[PDB]
């Protein structure tokens, strides 16, 4: 009870030292990966029949 | 004797009247239409509805009258005439083949289909659980295979035979023989109708003995069954009559010498619309009875 | 075309045709759902049938195999876990006679009864009541009587009528009177009793799923 | 896993009996068997095929229709009837099991044998390069082989199984599809091939490696086996 | 002091930590997500019909090969599907019919089942038997198993419906690590691609993340007002979504501690049963109750792709790692693969 309170304070103040970082450059993180990685993505380009293993 | 025999193998004793003509096209017309609408929305209905068993037999009916209502609105023109027919002996006997086809697997997918609902009630730890669909596709395969096989008799085709060079397309007459299609037209009626009468009885006494549900669904499936049956029996029985009353007369002296087939006639061929009735009434009631239509 | 895989394929028909089989076998049989609060009470219809998670009880009756599945002792939240048992035939709902004057406990089994009553995903599904505690419930109303929790209750204190008065206060909450069908019965201390009245009312359902089916409700 | 084989024994000529092989440690339902005999002088070969709903027989082209092959599931035994034998069906019998899926491993366990002995085209042809290559311990060899139909399938997978016989035992699958390490093997075992030219390598040779190496194909229904391999040490 | 002085610290935590959530606030994902041009409307078909399932399909999970998957329904069968060719693999009876969750091992030599049983049941794959058989028999746990996940070959993370979710070892089948920090009933799991955190979302529309050695809560969402039916994890590592029976889902960042966008319409209104992401992370897809799947825009958080084709309500939801296809279950039992 107290001592699970206690355990919300730590673990608060512990979250509160994780460098909460901001909204911005964690935006530009995801959109350099999405582009490095989006010329390859099959389901966002498919790749023709002849290359595609699912083809009929 | 103006009304002697049209003899091909048989005495058959064919009359010609004017009633005919004053009667028949307004039953006839009106049926086609309100058959043809009333079956085609139900298929089309069918078309886009599950695949449970239980609407195949249905969805076989609703085919057999779709078929069936096309051969009358032809019936009529051999009427309009007055036992006139225009067209050769190939399309005589392949549309009559077809409409006494359809009659008898429509009567046979009812009294099927009264089987089924007698299973469903009476007996419903039975192998009714889904008489798994290849099982009912088959059944429904050798039920028509049956049909059309008791009806090509029919179609070994003899002539469109002329009365005074006029072609009547007539299988119904009186004949000096019992031949096939006359028991045939007996058969069609005794045991379909003792079949469902009996499952009806069945499926009401088990529903009464301690089945009650009075909110408005046990109810209103015994009356719709009840008043299914009792249509078909108005249906089919005044021609069954009519027909057991020629023959008892043909048999009992008289078998020649224009008896009352004078009025006989005319009273048969007036009952046998009743049985086209029969097909425009069975859609309106079997399908459109369960709350999904 | 293929070399190998005709192998598979044939394994494949195999495999499924057992599954046909199998799904055969589990469609004839017939799925029952136990619900309640009070393990004794419970306990006394498995106890009074004759032939750690749920509880799976197997018992063959005129010829009709009944799977009843115990729920009691999940003590989990009814809300995420109650639509696994959709397509069960009925729910046997079980209550105490006797738990009236013990502590509210009866005004519990109701809000338990009109949570799984109203519940959307047994919107088709027949509820089977067993009042329990038939003879206990008859020695309390001579000691207490039954407008301590019940104050609208006005009436002459006898078994008869505090049980029609029960049983009446129980079926009001069906509000969708229409589609479902409670049969309400008391336990009897004589065996071969209860089953038999399980039976028939799994009939009358399996009857009524097959109307619906026929295209009559 | 045990497939024990026997009823083997003295034949005249176009003489008949049954071979019998029961089966334990292992579901016999699920997998296919296969016999394989193996001539004195000669190598392996294939003679029949059963999958595992008991469909789908196969008879090799030398033994079509006189040989035949059957078996009970509930009796957990597997029968092989032969007839009118001929010479040169004297050799040594084994049993092979086989299941087929996907990621699966088939003939990875072979019987201990039984021996039958007589009293006095179309097909795929498997050139082995060499019969005989003295090796020493701790050096490496290559066995390179030959199909006269590349087997590199549409599917991408290749159809070759590598066997392993040391001297007085029955063969050991050591390497199925050139690209997967049977069960019990060690990884010291490697395969490699372009589709019609197969190279099997056995880097840091040991004593037990002592044997005669067969090579299979399972592309066609007609199964061969290669003349062999002998190692010497 | 006593209970008054405790509660009012609790709400003073509370109010610091959305203080400081407000802190970082700074700007939402939409108007920096203008930059980049929208993926547009995807059309889907479905190339292979899985029909094998003849009850409701509950749960389901791709393998490592992008070939293989595991399908659980409530008939209690376990079902290994070959999507190249449509071909059953292997048939898991299980002694449970009641089965709403299964994973499938990152090997592919072990899976595991579970449901309303308390039960976490691990079935080996490749017995030189050929057949199928239990290995361990997970029964440590009280309430029903919701979501059971392979972290390793000997290591597994598994949640119950009660308040305690319990990280087990299969060579000695006994609880490493338990966490109590829920409070409600916990749905679903998800296993980051690193290994060493994993999301939990209960009823009480609490998400929590729990370390899989140190063994505590290190982060916590509220942003949901219903249950969390659903959760995954997107494909970087550092963000995860939710889904929830208020027919919205919405994607948290862990860095961020802060709910950056939520994915929704006013025509939906039903709950959400599964969700799972693409390989590029571009595209978020969700099960529905309706007889309807839905593709979102992960980024711009718009509907971009509809799967119609299902009758029933869908369950289950997962991507192959590689993103060449994607399979969605229903309660219809049939499984379809989509790409
Ligand atoms: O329907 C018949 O069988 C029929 C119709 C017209 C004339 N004769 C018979």
Redesign the pocket.
């Given at each position: 009870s107290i001592a699970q309170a206690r355990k919300l304070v730590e673990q608060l103040k512990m979250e509160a030292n994780i460098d909460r970082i901001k909204v911005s450059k964690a935006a530009a993180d995801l959109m350099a990966y999405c582009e490095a990685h989006a010329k390859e993505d099959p389901l966002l380009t498919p790749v023709p029949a002849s290359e595609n293993p699912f083809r009929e | 004797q103006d009304h002697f025999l049209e003899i091909d193998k048989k005495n058959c004793c064919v009359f010609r009247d004017d009633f005919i003509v004053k009667v028949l096209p307004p039953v006839l017309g009106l049926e086609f239409i309100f058959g043809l609408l009333g079956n085609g929305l139900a298929l089309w209905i069918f078309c886009f509805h599950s695949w449970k068993s239980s609407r195949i037999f249905l969805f076989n009916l609703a085919v057999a009258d779709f078929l069936l209502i096309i051969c009358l609105p032809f019936?009529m023109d051999?009427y309009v005439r007055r036992w006139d027919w225009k067209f050769g002996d190939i399309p005589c006997r392949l549309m009559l083949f077809m409409?006494?086809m359809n009659?008898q697997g429509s009567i046979i997918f009812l009294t099927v289909v009264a089987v089924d609902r007698y299973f469903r009630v009476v007996h419903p730890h039975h192998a009714l659980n889904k008489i798994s669909n290849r099982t009912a596709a088959i059944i429904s395969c050798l039920l028509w295979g049956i049909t059309i096989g008791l009806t090509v008799h029919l179609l070994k085709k003899k002539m469109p035979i002329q009365n005074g060079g006029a072609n009547l397309?007539?299988?119904?007459s009186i004949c000096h023989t019992f031949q096939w299609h006359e028991a045939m037209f007996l058969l069609e009626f005794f045991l379909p109708l003792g079949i469902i009468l009996f499952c009806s009885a069945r499926i009401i006494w088990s529903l009464r003995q301690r089945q009650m549900d009075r909110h408005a669904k046990i109810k209103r499936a015994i009356t719709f069954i009840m008043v299914v049956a009792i249509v078909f029996v108005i249906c089919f029985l005044p021609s069954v009559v009519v027909r057991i009353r020629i023959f008892w007369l043909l048999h009992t002296s008289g078998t020649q010498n224009c008896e009352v087939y004078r009025s006989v006639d005319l009273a048969f061929?007036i009952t046998?619309s009743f049985?086209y009735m029969n097909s425009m009434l069975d859609p309106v009631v079997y399908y459109f009875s369960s709350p999904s239509f | 075309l293929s070399a190998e895989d005709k192998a598979a394929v044939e394994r494949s028909k195999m495999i499924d045709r057992n599954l046909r089989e199998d799904g055969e076998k589990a469609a004839r049989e017939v799925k029952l759902l136990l619900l309640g609060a009070g393990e004794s009470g419970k306990n006394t219809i498995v106890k009074q049938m004759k032939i750690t998670g749920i509880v799976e009880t197997h018992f063959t009756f005129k010829d009709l195999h009944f799977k009843m599945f115990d729920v009691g002792a999940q003590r989990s939240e009814r809300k995420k876990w109650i639509h696994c048992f959709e397509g069960v035939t009925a729910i046997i709902f079980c209550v105490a006679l006797s738990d009236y004057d013990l502590v509210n406990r009866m005004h519990a089994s109701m809000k338990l009864f009109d949570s799984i009553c109203n519940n959307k995903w047994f919107t088709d599904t027949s509820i089977i009541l067993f009042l329990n505690k038939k003879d206990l419930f008859e020695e309390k109303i001579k000691k207490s009587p039954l407008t301590i929790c019940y104050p609208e209750y006005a009436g002459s204190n006898t078994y008869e009528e505090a049980a029609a008065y029960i049983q009446c206060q129980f079926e009001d909450l069906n509000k969708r009177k229409d589609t479902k069908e409670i049969y309400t019965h008391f336990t009897c201390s004589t065996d071969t009793k209860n089953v038999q009245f399980v039976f028939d009312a799994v009939t009358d359902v399996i009857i009524k799923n097959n109307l619906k089916d026929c295209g009559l409700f | 896993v045990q497939l024990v084989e026997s009823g083997g024994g003295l034949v005249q000529p176009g003489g008949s009996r049954k071979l019998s092989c029961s089966a334990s440690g292992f579901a016999f339902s699920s997998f296919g068997m296969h016999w394989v005999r193996q001539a004195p002088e000669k190598g392996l070969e294939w003679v029949a095929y059963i999958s595992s709903g008991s469909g789908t027989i196969y008879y090799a082209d030398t033994v079509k229709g006189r040989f035949t092959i059957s078996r009970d599931d509930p009796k957990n035994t597997l029968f092989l009837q032969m007839t009118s034998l001929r010479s040169e069906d004297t050799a040594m019998y084994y049993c092979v099991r086989s299941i087929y899926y996907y990621g699966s491993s088939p003939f990875d366990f072979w019987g201990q044998g039984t021996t039958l002995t007589v009293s006095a085209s179309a097909d795929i042809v498997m050139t082995q390069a060499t019969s005989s290559v003295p090796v020493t311990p701790g050096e490496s060899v290559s066995i390179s082989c030959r199909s006269s139909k590349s087997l590199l399938h549409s599917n991408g997978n290749t159809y070759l199984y590598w066997f392993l016989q040391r001297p007085g035992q029955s063969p050991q699958l050591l390497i199925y599809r050139m690209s997967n390490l049977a069960s019990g093997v060690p990884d010291r075992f490697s395969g490699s091939g372009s589709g019609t030219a197969f190279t099997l390598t056995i880097s840091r040779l040991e004593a037990e490696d002592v044997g005669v190496y067969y090579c299979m194909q399972h592309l066609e229904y007609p199964l061969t086996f290669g003349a062999g391999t002998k190692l010497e040490l | 002091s006593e209970l008054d002085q405790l509660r009012q610290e609790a709400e003073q935590l509370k109010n610091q930590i959305r203080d400081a959530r407000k802190a970082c606030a700074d700007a939402t994902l939409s108007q920096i997500t203008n930059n980049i041009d929208p993926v547009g409307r995807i059309q889907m078909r479905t190339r292979r019909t899985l029909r094998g399932h003849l009850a409701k399909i509950y749960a389901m999970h791709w393998g490592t090969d992008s070939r293989l998957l595991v399908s659980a329904s409530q008939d209690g069968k376990l079902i290994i599907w070959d999507s190249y060719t449509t071909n059953k693999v292997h048939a898991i009876p299980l002694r449970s019919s009641w089965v709403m969750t299964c994973a499938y091992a990152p090997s592919g030599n072990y899976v595991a089942c579970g449901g309303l049983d308390n039960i976490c049941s691990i079935y080996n794959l490749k017995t030189r038997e050929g057949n199928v058989r239990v290995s361990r028999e997970l029964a440590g746990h009280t309430g029903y198993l919701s979501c059971c996940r392979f972290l390793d070959d000997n290591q597994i993370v598994t949640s119950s419906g009660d308040t305690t979710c319990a990280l087990w070892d299969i060579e000695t089948g006994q609880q490493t690590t338990t966490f109590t920090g829920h409070t409600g009933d916990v749905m679903s799991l998800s296993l980051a691609p690193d290994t060493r955190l994993f999301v939990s979302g209960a009823c009480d529309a609490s998400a929590k993340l729990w370390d899989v050695r140190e063994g505590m809560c290190r982060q916590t969402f509220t942003g949901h007002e219903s249950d969390i039916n659903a959760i995954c994890f997107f494909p970087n590592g550092n963000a995860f979504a939710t889904g929830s029976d208020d027919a919205t889902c919405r994607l948290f960042d862990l860095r961020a501690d802060q709910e950056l966008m939520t994915y929704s319409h006013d025509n939906i209104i039903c709950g959400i049963t599964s969700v799972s992401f693409s390989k590029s992370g571009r595209l978020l897809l969700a099960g529905y109750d309706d007889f309807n799947c839905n593709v979102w825009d992960a980024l711009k958080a718009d509907r971009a792709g509809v799967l119609a084709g299902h009758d029933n309500r869908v369950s289950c939801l997962g991507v192959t790692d590689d993103g060449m296809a994607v399979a969605t279950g229903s309660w219809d039992s049939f499984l379809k693969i989509w790409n």
């Open positions: - | 019936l051999n409409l006494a009659r397309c007539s299988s119904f061929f046998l049985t | - | - | -």
